[PDB]
Design a binder for this molecule. Structure first.
Ligand SMILES: *[C@@H]1O[C@H](CO)[C@@H](O[C@@H]2O[C@H](CO)[C@@H](O[C@H]3O[C@H](CO)[C@@H](O)[C@H](O)[C@@H]3O)[C@H](O)[C@H]2NC(C)=O)[C@H](O)[C@H]1NC(C)=O
Ligand SMILES: *[C@@H]1O[C@H](CO)[C@@H](O[C@@H]2O[C@H](CO)[C@@H](O)[C@H](O)[C@H]2NC(C)=O)[C@H](O)[C@H]1NC(C)=O
Ligand SMILES: *[C@@H]1O[C@H](CO)[C@@H](O[C@@H]2O[C@H](CO)[C@@H](O)[C@H](O)[C@H]2NC(C)=O)[C@H](O)[C@H]1NC(C)=O
Ligand SMILES: *[C@@H]1O[C@H](CO)[C@@H](O[C@@H]2O[C@H](CO)[C@@H](O)[C@H](O)[C@H]2NC(C)=O)[C@H](O)[C@H]1NC(C)=O
Ligand SMILES: *[C@@H]1O[C@H](CO)[C@@H](O[C@@H]2O[C@H](CO)[C@@H](O)[C@H](O)[C@H]2NC(C)=O)[C@H](O)[C@H]1NC(C)=O
Ligand SMILES: *[C@@H]1O[C@H](CO)[C@@H](O)[C@H](O)[C@H]1NC(C)=O
Ligand SMILES: *[C@@H]1O[C@H](CO)[C@@H](O)[C@H](O)[C@H]1NC(C)=O
Ligand SMILES: *[C@@H]1O[C@H](CO)[C@@H](O)[C@H](O)[C@H]1NC(C)=O
Ligand SMILES: *[C@@H]1O[C@H](CO)[C@@H](O)[C@H](O)[C@H]1NC(C)=O
Ligand SMILES: N[C@@H](CCC(=O)O)C(=O)O
Lengths: 652, 66, 61, 66, 66
């Protein structure tokens, strides 16, 4: 029974839009008999808007109005707000220039723009800068009205953030059509910031990007971020816009006009339905232009309050008291190589989920140049050295001292764009070593775990694990519990061993007191068989197979699968000797309630080696990383890491 | 510097008072992150409650003013 | 290693405290030596099978 | 035997492992002992308990520790 | 008595010494407990075992330690 008026301001196929709708049989999902009434203004000038809305409102006792126009319009929002103030009719502006947020809205007016504020866009853009570790940005604004609000917003967002933002400079340019160009060209040649945040209209955006191209600020070493205002129709980006331009829009950016009209009518219907369900009657229709209802008439105010908070199809259309969308689902889009507005990230709740764990950079047209100081590091969880955690959904990110890491997976478990890659957080001894190396050698890096194998094993001539990743050029280097031996050192380069290790035997309480003991060499000789085994596919298994054939043949039976499972079996009594890596066995012995003892003092490490950072053969990072590790060892920082990570309860 | 505090476990339970100077001290330090998380999981509302918990074996160690 | 061997063989002397600068002994060659890789591989193989343990037993018990 | 090369062995002249020192009225510092012998060309390879550290590694290639 | 000022003593509402916590959705940070009472204006003086540290000293003025 509720009547909703749909006003079309688009100057293109207006008749087509009018003919597509006005059928009341549509909108059956809503729990009301929607009565749509089309208008379709012609030239969307002030006189036409006022006359058509007044003729519409004073005739059909309409409840609400849904308005849509093109992105070219600038002052239409003010006129719509003025009409709403005069007639107290709820309005829903969807798409176009009328959806750009007007912060101060005529206190007694129900305008309710379906757009997002400038400070919310700034929040999302600064979260994007946080994600890729981009600081030292610069702000470029034009004489466009409202740039002062933009500067206030950037300063407030930068100050109210844990990361130490460093704004280099702000500079204001005329950016007018056909005017002073040398004046702005002089200033644009002095900008040194690698990240540039701009605020201007579409035409000023095109002029600014042309001048920036003349000044060489468009190449692969410059990132531009702009709000929705700078871009216009996303369907046809202009030629001046550079690739990699980043912006943040709402989730309805890819919806058709019919879908947006349906959403607006749904919001009005749900508001009216809630109001009727509470008050037992439908809200009163709006007034007329030939009067001024001075009082708010709390019947109207209650309906406005009900219109504020609305949920529809699992999407939150909750409206701020400032009459704009609050806590909305935002997406972060960018202009790709094909000059299309591709979707990059999402802003579900207060958490950022974006593809491209490393931001791709293109040299102008093509040739996606790769950063020379960005290393791709492979690893996996080992417990004393690499620990993975899920970041807290409440805070979005994860605690400091914990580097963000990702899983080794492509777009097949994503099932679209819900979670393209698993975002975890890694910490531990090796991660601390990596952070120190990054701060000393001065390189950037990402971090991804390994899902094909664990450590490395030449299976039919093909390597898996970290050694496989590094050998096949998929990762620049691998860190973690990676032991140095001859077979791996032939294939790839290894750094200096920063932590000593080797083969060690763990027993539960001297029993054998040596790897070359009689019990290990000939278990099958007599007595209840000595039950000793190991986790296969590692340095220890390789060493045992290459040196002692009979022992390996006997240990084939007790082929354990996990270190924890092996300790459980050792405690239960299913085996009495466990042969593994010394660095991890010492840690496992230290933090034990029963205080398991290594087979001899200090374990008597056999086949002494160390953990190394595997690198591609003949790589240029080898010498720098070796020198950095030796410096860390000399300064005693590795000792501090060992104290804070490898300390044991009953090692003493 | 005891290894038990630096290696938190479910069996050992140590904490302090919420919204106090000890919270700031452990939060600002980076090398005390694991201890900070373990303490935050079991922080008490007041000093008297933590003392009583220590007497009642519900809490193993209480970190507070000298 | 040297101090521990001296204390063990000569007696009358004792080593005190924990190791405060852990490192290793390595064969030194000129920078970018062509056979640095071969020396490193040979040393790794000697560690792996039995040779370093045999040398340790023979010379510095 | 493994790498198939013959050799001739000699002792270090001054009986020092090696360090960098600046004698007065010198334009630069120079390594002494075994390090100086290897850098100057008197030796091709150092087979001795030579410690691996950052200062020496800048001028000298080290094998994996034995 | 020494400075001849009258006083009236009241206990802090939430019984917390005071730290900085962000408002709900990662908004501006505010002080809890006695520090918040002093900063907001509900109290003119904090007479309690309040520990002197850097974070609190940026906003309030501490006396010499008693
Ligand atoms: C480090 O060890 C490497 C493996 O033993 C060794 O590579 C080997 O080099 C010899 C050359 O002396 C190659 O022999 C080939 O070339 C000679 C001379 O051209 C021919 O007369 C032979 O018939 C043969 O075709 C070996 O093939 C080669 N081995 C491998 C696996 O590539 C390095 O030379 C050693 N590095 C040194 C000595 O500095
Ligand atoms: C949306 O907000 C309105 C306004 O606060 C809510 O309406 C209130 O509902 C409570 C629930 O019984 C009543 O006690 C109030 O009298 C209502 N106020 C008004 C002005 O109507 C409404 O419930 C909210 N809707 C949802 C889904 O939370
Ligand atoms: C050690 O390596 C072997 C062989 O690569 C692994 O055995 C494979 O286990 C997977 C189970 O995920 C099977 O799908 C493969 O068919 C097995 N391969 C063979 C040749 O049988 C074994 O799981 C590895 N052990 C580890 C990683 O602990
Ligand atoms: C070890 O080195 C000796 C000499 O350095 C090698 O003897 C000769 O090496 C030359 C070098 O090419 C060959 O042309 C000759 O044929 C070798 N002599 C003989 C009798 O074969 C010797 O071959 C080397 N051993 C190896 C490479 O295993
Ligand atoms: C608190 O005490 C001080 C002195 O201990 C007072 O200061 C003076 O008090 C004498 C009383 O004989 C007055 O005649 C003076 O005029 C006071 N001087 C000043 C500068 O105030 C002080 O007045 C007392 N505070 C009160 C009474 O509120
Ligand atoms: C006004 O609308 C009519 C049809 O509704 C259309 O034919 C006419 O072109 C419009 N006016 C302008 C200036 O486009
Ligand atoms: C994606 O990952 C799966 C493993 O889940 C793998 O089987 C597949 O080959 C991968 N596709 C790629 C890398 O294109
Ligand atoms: C400088 O070096 C020369 C070299 O023999 C020495 O004779 C002289 O005494 C030195 N001067 C000093 C130490 O002041
Ligand atoms: C805001 O904070 C209050 C008090 O801690 C809490 O109850 C509420 O759940 C929070 N809401 C959000 C959206 O964070
Ligand atoms: N880090 C080991 C794996 C575990 C071990 O062998 O101790 C390796 O190089 O394969």
């Amino acid at each position: 029974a509720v009547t909703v008026a749909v006003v079309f301001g688009s100057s293109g196929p207006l008749q087509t839009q009018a003919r597509t709708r006005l059928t009341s049989q549509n909108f059956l999902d809503l729990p009301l008999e929607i009565q749509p009434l089309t208008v379709g203004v012609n030239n969307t000038n002030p006189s036409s808007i006022l006359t058509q809305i007044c003729g519409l409102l004073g005739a059909a006792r309409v409840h609400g109005i849904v308005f849509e126009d093109n992105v070219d319009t600038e002052a239409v929002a003010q006129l719509l707000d003025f009409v709403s103030s005069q007639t107290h009719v709820p309005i829903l502006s969807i798409s176009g220039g009328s959806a750009v947020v007007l912060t101060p809205k005529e206190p007694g007016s129900a305008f309710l723009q379906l757009g997002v504020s400038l400070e919310q866009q700034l929040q999302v853009l600064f979260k994007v800068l946080e994600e890729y570790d981009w600081s030292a940005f610069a702000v470029i604004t034009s004489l466009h009205p409202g740039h002062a609000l933009f500067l206030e917003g950037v300063r407030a967002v930068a100050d109210a953030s844990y990361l130490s933002w460093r704004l280099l400079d702000v500079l204001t340019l005329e950016l007018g059509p056909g005017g002073p160009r040398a004046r702005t060209q002089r200033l644009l040649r002095q900008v040194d910031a690698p990240v540039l945040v701009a605020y201007c209209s579409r035409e000023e955006a095109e002029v600014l990007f042309a001048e920036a191209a003349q000044a060489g600020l468009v190449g692969p070493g410059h990132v531009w971020l702009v709000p929705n205002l700078a871009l216009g129709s996303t369907d046809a980006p202009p030629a001046a816009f550079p690739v990699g331009l980043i912006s943040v829009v709402t989730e309805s950016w890819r919806l058709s006009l019919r879908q947006k009209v349906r959403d607006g009518v749904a919001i009005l219907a749900l508001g009216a339905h809630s109001y009727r369900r509470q008050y037992g009657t439908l809200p009163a229709p709006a007034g007329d232009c030939r009067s001024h209802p001075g009082p708010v008439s709390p019947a109207r105010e209650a309906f406005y309050r009900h219109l504020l908070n609305v949920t529809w199809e699992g999407r939150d259309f909750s409206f701020s008291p400032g009459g704009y969308l609050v806590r909305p689902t935002m997406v972060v889009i960018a202009l790709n190589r094909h000059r299309l507005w591709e979707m990059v990230g999402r802003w579900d709740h207060g958490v950022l989920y974006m593809k491209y764990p490393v931001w791709p950079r293109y040299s102008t047209s093509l040739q996606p140049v790769v950063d020379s100081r960005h290393l791709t590091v492979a690893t996996l969880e080992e417990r004393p050295f690499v620990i993975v955690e899920s970041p807290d959904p409440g805070t979005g990110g994860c605690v400091p001292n914990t580097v963000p890491c990702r899983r080794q997976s492509n777009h097949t478990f994503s099932s679209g764009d819900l979670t393209p890659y698993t975002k975890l957080c890694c910490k531990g001894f090796c991660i601390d070593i990596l952070k120190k190396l990054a701060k000393v050698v001065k390189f950037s890096y990402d971090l991804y775990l390994v899902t094909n194998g664990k450590h490395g094993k030449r299976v039919r001539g093909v390597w898996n694990g970290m050694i496989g990743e590094v050998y096949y050029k998929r990762a620049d280097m691998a860190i973690g519990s990676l032991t140095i031996n001859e077979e791996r050192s032939e294939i790839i380069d290894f750094s200096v061993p920063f932590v000593e290790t080797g083969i060690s035997v763990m027993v539960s309480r001297d029993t054998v007191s040596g790897l070359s003991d009689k019990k290990f060499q000939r278990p099958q000789d007599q007595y209840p068989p000595f039950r000793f085994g190991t986790v296969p596919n590692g340095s220890t298994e390789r060493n045992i197979r290459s040196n002692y054939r009979d022992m390996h043949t006997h240990m084939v039976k007790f082929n354990q699968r996990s270190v924890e499972d092996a300790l459980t079996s050792l405690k239960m009594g299913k085996l009495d000797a466990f042969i593994y890596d010394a660095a991890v066995l010492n840690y496992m012995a230290g933090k034990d309630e029963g205080c398991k003892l290594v087979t001899i003092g200090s374990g008597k490490v056999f086949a002494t080696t160390g953990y190394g950072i595997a690198m591609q053969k003949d790589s240029h990072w080898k010498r720098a990383i070796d020198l950095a590790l030796l410096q860390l060892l000399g300064d005693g920082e590795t000792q501090k890491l060992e104290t804070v990570w490898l300390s044991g309860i009953c090692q003493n | 510097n005891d290894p038990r505090l630096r290696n938190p476990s479910d069996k050992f339970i140590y904490a302090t008072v919420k919204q106090s100077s000890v919270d700031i001290y452990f939060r600002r330090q980076v090398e005390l992150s694991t201890m900070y998380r373990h303490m935050e999981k079991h922080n008490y509302e007041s000093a008297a409650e933590a003392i009583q918990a220590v007497r009642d074996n519900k809490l193993h160690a209480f970190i507070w003013d000298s | 290693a040297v101090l521990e061997f001296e204390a063990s063989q000569k007696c009358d002397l004792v080593t005190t405290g924990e190791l405060f600068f852990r490192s290793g002994f390595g064969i030194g060659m000129r920078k970018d030596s062509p056979w640095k890789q071969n020396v490193s591989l040979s040393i790794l193989k000697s560690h792996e099978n039995g040779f370093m343990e045999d040398l340790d037993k023979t010379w510095v018990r | 035997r493994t790498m198939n090369f013959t050799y001739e062995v000699h002792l270090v002249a001054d009986g020092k492992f090696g360090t960098q020192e600046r004698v007065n009225n010198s334009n630069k510092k120079e390594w002494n002992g075994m390090m100086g012998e290897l850098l100057s060309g008197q030796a091709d390879m150092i087979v001795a308990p030579l410690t691996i550290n950052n200062e020496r590694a800048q001028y000298i290639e080290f094998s994996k520790p034995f």
